[PDB]
Design a protein around this nucleic acid. Structure first.
Ligand SMILES: [Cl-]
Ligand code: NA
Ligand SMILES: [Zn+2]
Ligand SMILES: [Zn+2]
Ligand SMILES: [Zn+2]
Length: 120
DNA sequence: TGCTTCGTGCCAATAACG
DNA sequence: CGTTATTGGCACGAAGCA
């Protein structure tokens, strides 16, 4: 037992018992709760670091390999993560990649074995 | 104050089951 | 191998940090 619920205007929110963060999804509360319980460990397969969420380890491991999955479509430069790509496109191209038009391509991950999304 | 990492709704892909 | 149950990839704003 790791949560209680709160219902406001007919909307259900799941509240973590330890820190009282609220979640629209019970799956998000569970993913978050590992930060408290450390029931599940996600150790980096290249260094000593251990993370409480799978996605923190994955994004960390890409720094080890150096794969540059985020490609600017305006000039072709590639970047290790969304933030570098977004900042490049905003400052060099004066355009916002968030939604609207598709200014970048996310290539599949080939330097690690992670789940493969067919839309890439 | 610009890099660095975190965080969470959404949901597709993979794990689990026996 | 057939479904479903669960994980975790992703965006991109938030937070951390020097
Ligand atoms: Cl690359
Ligand atoms: Na968001
Ligand atoms: Zn919590
Ligand atoms: Zn590492
Ligand atoms: Zn560019």
């Amino acid at each position: 037992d790791d949560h209680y619920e709160l219902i406001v205007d007919g909307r259900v929110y799941y509240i973590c018992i330890v820190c009282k963060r609220s979640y629209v999804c019970l799956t998000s509360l569970r993913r978050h709760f590992n930060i408290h319980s450390w029931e599940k460990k996600y150790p980096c397969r290249y260094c000593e670091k251990v993370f409480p969420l799978a996605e923190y380890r994955t994004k960390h491991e890409i720094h080890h390999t150096g794969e540059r999955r985020y490609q600017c479509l305006a000039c072709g430069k590639s970047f290790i993560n969304y933030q570098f790509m977004s900042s490049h496109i905003k400052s060099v191209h004066s355009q916002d990649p968030s939604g609207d038009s598709k200014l970048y391509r996310l290539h599949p991950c080939r330097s690690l074995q992670i789940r493969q999304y067919a839309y890439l």
